[PDB]
Short mmCIF file of C-alpha atoms and ligand atoms in Angstrom, two decimals:
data_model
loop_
_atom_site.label_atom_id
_atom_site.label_comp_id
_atom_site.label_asym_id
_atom_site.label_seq_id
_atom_site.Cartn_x
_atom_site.Cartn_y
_atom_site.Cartn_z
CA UNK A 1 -27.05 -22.02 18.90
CA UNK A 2 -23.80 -23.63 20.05
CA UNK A 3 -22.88 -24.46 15.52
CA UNK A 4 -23.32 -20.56 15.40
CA UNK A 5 -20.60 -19.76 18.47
CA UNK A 6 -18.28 -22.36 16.45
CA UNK A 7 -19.33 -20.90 13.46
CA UNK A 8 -17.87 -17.53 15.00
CA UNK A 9 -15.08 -18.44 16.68
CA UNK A 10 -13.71 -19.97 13.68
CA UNK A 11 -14.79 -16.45 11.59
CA UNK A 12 -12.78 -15.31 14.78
CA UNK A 13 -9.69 -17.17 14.03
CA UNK A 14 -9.77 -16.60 10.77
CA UNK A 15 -9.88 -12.94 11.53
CA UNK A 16 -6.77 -13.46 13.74
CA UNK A 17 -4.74 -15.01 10.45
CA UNK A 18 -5.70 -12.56 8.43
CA UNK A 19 -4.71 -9.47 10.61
CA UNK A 20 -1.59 -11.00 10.70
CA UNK A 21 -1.30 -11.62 6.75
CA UNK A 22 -2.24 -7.88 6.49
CA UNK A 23 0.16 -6.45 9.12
CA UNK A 24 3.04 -8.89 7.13
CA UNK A 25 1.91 -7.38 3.76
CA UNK A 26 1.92 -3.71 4.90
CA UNK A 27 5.57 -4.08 6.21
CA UNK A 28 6.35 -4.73 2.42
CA UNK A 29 5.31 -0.86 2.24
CA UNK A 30 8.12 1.00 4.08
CA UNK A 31 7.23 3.87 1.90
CA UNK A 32 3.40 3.79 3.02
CA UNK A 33 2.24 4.49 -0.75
CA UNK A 34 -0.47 1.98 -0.28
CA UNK A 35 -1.50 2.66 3.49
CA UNK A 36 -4.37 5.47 2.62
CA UNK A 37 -6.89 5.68 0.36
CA UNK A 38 -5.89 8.06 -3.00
CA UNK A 39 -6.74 11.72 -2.28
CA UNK A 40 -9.92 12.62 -4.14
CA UNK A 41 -9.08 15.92 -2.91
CA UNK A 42 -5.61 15.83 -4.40
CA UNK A 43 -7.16 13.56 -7.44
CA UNK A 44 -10.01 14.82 -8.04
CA UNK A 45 -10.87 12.11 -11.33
CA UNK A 46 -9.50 9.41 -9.79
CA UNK A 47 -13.15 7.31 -9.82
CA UNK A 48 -12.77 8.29 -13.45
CA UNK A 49 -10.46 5.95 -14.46
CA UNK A 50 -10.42 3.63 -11.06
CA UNK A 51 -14.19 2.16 -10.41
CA UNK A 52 -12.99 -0.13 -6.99
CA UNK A 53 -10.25 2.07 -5.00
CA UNK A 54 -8.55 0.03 -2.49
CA UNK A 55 -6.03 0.36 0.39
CA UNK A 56 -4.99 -1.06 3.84
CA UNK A 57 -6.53 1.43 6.11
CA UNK A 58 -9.94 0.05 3.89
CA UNK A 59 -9.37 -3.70 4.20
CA UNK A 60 -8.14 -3.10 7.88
CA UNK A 61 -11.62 -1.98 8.73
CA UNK A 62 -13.30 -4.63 7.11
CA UNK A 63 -10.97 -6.71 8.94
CA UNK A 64 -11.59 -5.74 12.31
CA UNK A 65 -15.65 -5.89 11.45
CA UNK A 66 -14.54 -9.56 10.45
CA UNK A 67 -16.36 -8.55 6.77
CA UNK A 68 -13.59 -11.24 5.15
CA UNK A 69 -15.55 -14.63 4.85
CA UNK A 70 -12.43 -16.67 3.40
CA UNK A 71 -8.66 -15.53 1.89
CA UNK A 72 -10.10 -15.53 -1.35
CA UNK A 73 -12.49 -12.53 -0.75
CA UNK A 74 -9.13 -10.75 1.24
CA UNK A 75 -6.81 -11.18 -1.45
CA UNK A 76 -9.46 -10.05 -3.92
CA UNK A 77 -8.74 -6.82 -2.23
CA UNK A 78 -4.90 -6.61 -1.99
CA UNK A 79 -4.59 -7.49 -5.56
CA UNK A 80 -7.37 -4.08 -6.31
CA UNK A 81 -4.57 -2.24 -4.28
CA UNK A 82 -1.54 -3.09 -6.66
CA UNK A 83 -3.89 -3.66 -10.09
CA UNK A 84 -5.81 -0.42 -9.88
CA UNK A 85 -1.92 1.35 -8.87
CA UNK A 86 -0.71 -0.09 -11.92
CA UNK A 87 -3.72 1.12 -14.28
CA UNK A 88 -3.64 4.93 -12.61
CA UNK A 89 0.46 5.08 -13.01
CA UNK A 90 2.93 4.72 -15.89
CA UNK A 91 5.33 1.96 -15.73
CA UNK A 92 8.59 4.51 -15.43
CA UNK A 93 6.87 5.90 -11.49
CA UNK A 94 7.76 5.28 -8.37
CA UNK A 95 4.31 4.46 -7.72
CA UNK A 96 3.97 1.74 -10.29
CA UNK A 97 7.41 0.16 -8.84
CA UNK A 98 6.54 -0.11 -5.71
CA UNK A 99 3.31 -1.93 -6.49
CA UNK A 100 5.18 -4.36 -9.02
CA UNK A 101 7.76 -4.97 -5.40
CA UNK A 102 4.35 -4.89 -3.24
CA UNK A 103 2.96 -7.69 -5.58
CA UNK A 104 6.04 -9.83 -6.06
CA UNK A 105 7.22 -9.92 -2.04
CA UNK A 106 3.37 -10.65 -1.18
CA UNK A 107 3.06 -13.60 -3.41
CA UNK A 108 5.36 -15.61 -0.83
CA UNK A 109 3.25 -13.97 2.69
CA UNK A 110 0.02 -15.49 0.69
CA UNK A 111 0.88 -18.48 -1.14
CA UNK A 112 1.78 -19.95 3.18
CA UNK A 113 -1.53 -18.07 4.42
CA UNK A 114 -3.39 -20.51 1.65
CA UNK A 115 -1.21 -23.66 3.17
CA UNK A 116 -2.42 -21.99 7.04
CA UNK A 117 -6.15 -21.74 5.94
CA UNK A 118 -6.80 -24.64 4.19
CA UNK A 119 -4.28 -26.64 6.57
CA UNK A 120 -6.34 -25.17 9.98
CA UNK A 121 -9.83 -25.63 7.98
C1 TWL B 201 1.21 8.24 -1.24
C2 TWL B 201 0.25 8.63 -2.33
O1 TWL B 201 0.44 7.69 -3.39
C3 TWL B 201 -0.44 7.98 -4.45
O2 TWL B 201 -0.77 9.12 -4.76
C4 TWL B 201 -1.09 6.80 -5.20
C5 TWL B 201 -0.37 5.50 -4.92
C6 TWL B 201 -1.40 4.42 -4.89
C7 TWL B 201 -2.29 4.66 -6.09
N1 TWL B 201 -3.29 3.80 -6.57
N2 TWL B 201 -3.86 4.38 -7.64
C8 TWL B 201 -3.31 5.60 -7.90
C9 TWL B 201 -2.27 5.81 -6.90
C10 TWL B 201 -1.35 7.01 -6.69
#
């Protein structure tokens, strides 16, 4: 049907915002702590005391399958990335830090990608 080509192409576009949300976000992470997921190798409890892991390689391929319906469902997963950081490390780690910097400089990228979306439709 011609609504399910629309339909797509605006899935499509919305795809196109995103990618550029995420590449924004991930330049926030000079040190790359967040690029990979943790190391079960090198953790080997982690899914012990983190049920959801998260990271940007992840949502990256969900992003290029266009798996993100709306922001809402997107940012659902950046915020995993610095809450479940927060949980694994103490507050005195570089680790912890960088998410609290990760989570304050993002704040700004996403509250104008809300304005975009919602503006665009
Ligand atoms: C570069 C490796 O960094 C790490 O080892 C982790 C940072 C992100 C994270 N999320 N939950 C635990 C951890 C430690």
């Amino acid at each position: 049907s011609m609504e399910q080509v629309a339909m797509e192409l605006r899935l499509t576009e919305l795809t196109r915002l995103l990618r550029s949300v995420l590449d924004q976000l991930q330049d926030k992470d000079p040190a790359r702590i967040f690029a990979q997921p943790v190391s079960l190798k090198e953790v080997p409890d982690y899914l012990d005391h983190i049920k959801h892991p998260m990271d940007f390689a992840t949502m990256r391929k969900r992003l290029e399958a266009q798996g993100y319906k709306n922001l809402h469902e997107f940012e659902e997963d950046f915020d995993l990335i610095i809450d479940n950081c927060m949980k694994y490390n103490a507050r005195d780690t570089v680790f912890y830090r960088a998410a609290v910097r990760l989570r304050d400089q993002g704040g700004v990228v996403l509250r104008q990608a809300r304005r975009e979306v919602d503006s665009i439709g």
